[PDB]
Design a protein around this ligand. Sequence first.
Ligand code: MG
Ligand code: MG
Ligand code: MG
Lengths: 131, 66, 26, 100, 154, 101, 199, 132, 138
Amino acid sequence: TKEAPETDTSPSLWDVEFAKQLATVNEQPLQNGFEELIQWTKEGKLWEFPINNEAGFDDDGSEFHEHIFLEKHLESFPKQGPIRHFMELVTCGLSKNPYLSVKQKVEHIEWFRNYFNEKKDILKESNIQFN
Amino acid sequence: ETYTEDFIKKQIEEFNIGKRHLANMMGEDPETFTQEDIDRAIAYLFPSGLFEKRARPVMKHPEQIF
Amino acid sequence: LQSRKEYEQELSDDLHVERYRQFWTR
Amino acid sequence: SLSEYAFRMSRLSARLFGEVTRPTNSKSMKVVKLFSELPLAKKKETYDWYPNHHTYAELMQTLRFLGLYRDEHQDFMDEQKRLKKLRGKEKPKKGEGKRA
Amino acid sequence: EEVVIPKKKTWDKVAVLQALASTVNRDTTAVPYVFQDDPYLMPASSLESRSFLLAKKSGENVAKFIINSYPKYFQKDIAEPHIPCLMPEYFEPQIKDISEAALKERIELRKVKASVDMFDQLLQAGTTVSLETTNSLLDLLCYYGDQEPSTDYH
Amino acid sequence: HYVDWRMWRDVKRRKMAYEYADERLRINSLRKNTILPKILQDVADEEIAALPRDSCPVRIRNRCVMTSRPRGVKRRWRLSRIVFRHLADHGQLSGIQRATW
Amino acid sequence: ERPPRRKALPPRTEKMAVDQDWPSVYPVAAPFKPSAVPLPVRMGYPVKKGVPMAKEGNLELLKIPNFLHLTPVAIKKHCEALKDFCTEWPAALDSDEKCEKHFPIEIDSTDYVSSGPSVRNPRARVVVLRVKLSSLNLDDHAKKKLIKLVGERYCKTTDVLTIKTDRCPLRRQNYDYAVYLLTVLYHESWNTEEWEKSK
Amino acid sequence: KNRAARVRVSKGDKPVTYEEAHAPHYIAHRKGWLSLHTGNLDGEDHAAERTVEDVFLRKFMWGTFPGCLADQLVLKRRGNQLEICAVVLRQLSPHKYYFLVGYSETLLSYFYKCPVRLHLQTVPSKVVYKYL
Amino acid sequence: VDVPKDLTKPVVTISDEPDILYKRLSVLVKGHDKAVLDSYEYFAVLAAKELGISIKVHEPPRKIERFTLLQSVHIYKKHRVQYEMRTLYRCLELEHLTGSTADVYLEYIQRNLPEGVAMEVTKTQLEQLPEHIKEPIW
Ligand SMILES: [Mg+2]
Ligand SMILES: [Mg+2]
Ligand SMILES: [Mg+2]
C-alpha cells in the first residue's frame, strides 16, 4: 500500500462523514448494565477506577523543586537587608502552600517587586536601596 | 385482612418456588437447604442495619409469618 | 541584655541549588 | 538557650527542610502563616457558601413556561393574584399610585 | 541474593468491565435493557418497542434543546475531572469580523447560508481567499447540496 | 431571586471579598511584621483601608442557604436549626438519626 | 377509549426457572426490582395481627443497598476472569524480614473513595517515607548527626526514620520531595563541618 | 406535644404509607434513610452540597411528575453515579413516562455534571400501610 | 442454545517495565449500617480468596458524633432534640500485593462499593535505596 499517508493534511468533510457511516453499522443499543458503564467510561462521564484523587489534575507538569525552591525569583530583590529578610519569609510560606500553583506563587513574588519599585523613595529615606 | 385457606395454600407454593430460587443464587443444594440458610442468604442479599429485627427483611414459612 | 554571636549571624549555604542540584533527577 | 553545636545543627536542619533560617520573632512568623494557607475568602466554603439562587429559580421558571415543570406553589399565587383582580385589589400602576 | 520482580501488566481503562461482562450472559426472561424493567413499562409489542425508544429519545432531544437554548443555567462545572460531553454546545459564530480566519469558523459550524454569504462579501471586499478555505467551502456545500443541515429547532 | 435582600447583600460581600482577597492578603502581609520600616507599614495601613468596605472578610455572615436565617446555623450543612430538623426528621439526610443513649 | 385501560403484564419472575443463571439477571449493581427478584421476601414492621409488607410497592426494600449483584456464584465467576489481570507475587520474599532486606524503604499513600461529582481530596497528597537507619550505609559520625538533624522524625525504639511531605499539591511531587529529603539528609550527615568541633 | 413528621390520628379513613406512619424516632429502628451518601460520615467533606442537591431533586421530580409519584424518592450515590428510585402510579400513559425519564435523566446529568439514572417502580395504586 | 460461539477476551499486555510491590493494603470502609459492612466484608473476603490474596479482617471501634439542637422554633430553651451520626468501621488488611494485583482487586471492589459507604485505602509501597544514596559523594 502507500508508504506515507497524508496524515498531516486535515481530512475533508466527505472523509469525516464517511467515517460516521462506518460507526453507524456497528452502532447497537445497550444490552446489559456492564455496557452502560463501559460507554460512560469511554465518554468520560463515569469515574475511572481504581480511584485517583488527582485524575485529570496536573498543574502544568510542575516538579517539586519549582514549588519549594523559589529563590530563583528573588534575583531582582536586594541580596541583604530587611527586604531580603521579609521576602525570605514570603518564599518560605509560599513553599509550604499546596493550594497555589507555581504560576500563582510567582505572581505574589512579582507583586512585591513592583510594589517596592513604586515605593523606592520611601525605602531610600529608610537607608534601603531597591534596584 | 382475612387470610383464607386458599390464600395460604398459594403462599406456601410460592415459598417453595422461591426457596429453590434462593438456593440457586447462593450456589447450594436446594434439597439440603434449611431455614437457617435462608436467613443467612437474606441478611447478605438484603443487608439491613435497622435496630429492630422485626423491621429487617424476612423470608419464612407462611405458617410462621401469617 | 542582647545576645549576638559570630555563628548566629552566618548565612546557611544554599546546598540545594549548588551542592545537591544533581539529585533532583533519578 | 542552646550551645553553638546545637544552634548551628538546628539551623542546618531548617535549611534542609526549608523552614525559616534567619532568627525571626513570633510576630513576623505570621507572614509565613499568611502565605502558607489560602485566605478565608479564597476558601471554597466562603465564595461558594450559597447555591446560585439565580440559576435555580430561573431554570424552574423557564421550565415552568416550557410546560415541563408544574410549580404547584407558583400556581397557588397566580390563582390568588387572579382572584384579587376580580375583587378589585389589583396592584396599582407604578408612578401613577394612590398618593401623588 | 537477587529477587525477580514480575513484569507489570497494562490494560485499558475499560478492560476490567469488559472482563466482568464476559462472566454473565443475556437474560432470556427480560426485555432489552434500554427499556424499563417494570411490568407496566415493559413494551408489549414490536410497535411499542419502536415507539418507546423513540419517545425516550424524544425526551433527550427536548432536554438537549433547553440546554442549548439557555446555556447560562448549565455553565457551572463542579465535576472533577472536567466532563466535556456534559457541557452546553455553542453553534453561533463568535467572530463578527469579515475575514478569511473568521470565515473558517462558520465552515466548521456547517452554516452553509452564513458561509456562502460571507464568502461573497469577502470576495466583494477584495481580500484574497486561500485555496484550502475555498476547497473547504466546496466540500460543505457539495455534501449538503446548498441546504441547511437539520437542526433541533429554529 | 435570593431569599431576601440580606442574603443578596451577603452574596455581594462574599463576591467582593473573593476578588480582593489576593490584593488584601499581600498588603496585609506588610503590616503583620516587624522587619519592614514603620514608614512602609503606615503606607500599607492607608492602602488597605482604601479598599472597599465590603471586601473585608469580617463582614461576611454565615447564613442558612435555604431560609437565610442569621443564627442557629450548622456549618457542616449550612442549614438553620429549623430547616435541618425538617430534613432530618423525614429521613432525607443520610446517616442522621435521633440520638438516644 | 377504543382499548380498555392498559394492563400491566405479569412479572417476569414467573418465567424464571429454578436453575436459571442468576448473575445474568443482576449483572451490575441495580435497585431492588420486585418484578425482577423471584423471592417472596417481606420487609417492614408488622401491625398488630399483621404481616410484613409485600415486596411489591415496598419502599423499605428499595432503600436497602442489596447485594443481589454480588451473589457467591457470581463472585467466584467474576474472579475467574480477573486472574489474567493479576501478577504473581515474588516467592523469594517469603516473610516480612526478607522484604525489609531487599526493600528497606517503605512509602505510604492514601486514596479516598467518596460519592459525589468531585473526586478531589486534599488528604491524598500526603506521602510518608519510612526507612531504618540500620539499612543505610552510615558510620558513627553521620548516624549521630542524622538523628539530630531530623529531630523527632526518627524513632529510637524502632530505629525507623519517618519523613512526612505534604507541601506540593500533587502526590507524585511529594513522593519526589520525600526521596529528595532522604538523599540530602544522608549526604549532609556524612559531611563534617569545621564548627562541629565545638560539640 | 411533638408535631414533627407525625401524621395525626384521623377517624380511621386516612391512608398513610409506611414512611409517613413512622415518627422521627424510627429513622434508625423501623425505617431507613430516603437518601444514601457519604456526606455525613466521619471525616468526609462536601456534606452541605449533597444536601442542597437532594432537596432540589425531590422538588424537581415532584414537578416533573405531577400527581405521578406514589411515595417519597430514594436517592443513591455510588462514586460518580447518581441513581434516583421512585414509585409512581399506573395512571399516566407509558409514552409520557418514557418521555420524562429521557428528559429528566439528560437534564439532571447536564445540570449536576454527573451521570444520572432514574428507576421507576409502578404500582396499581398508592400502597397503604395502615389507616389512621 | 443461543450461546456465543467465540468470545473476545480483553487485551492485556505484559509490559517490559517492572511492577510495583505493595507491602500492605489497609482497606478501611466506613458506613452508617453494620449489616451493609458485614455484607461488603463477605464480598471482599470471598473475592480475595478466589484471587489468591492473603487478607485479614478486624473491626475498628465505632465512632458516634452527637450534637444538640433547639426543639421549638421560638424560645423554650430547656427543650432540645439530639441527633447522632454513627460511623461504623471495617478494616481489610491485604498483604504481599503487586501493583497490577492491587489495581485489579481495588477496581473490582470499589465499583461494587455500596451507596453510603466510604473507603480509605492506605498503600504501603516497597522501594529500594536511591542510586544517589548507594555511596557518599564527599
Ligand atoms: Mg418575598
Ligand atoms: Mg461575624
Ligand atoms: Mg417534650
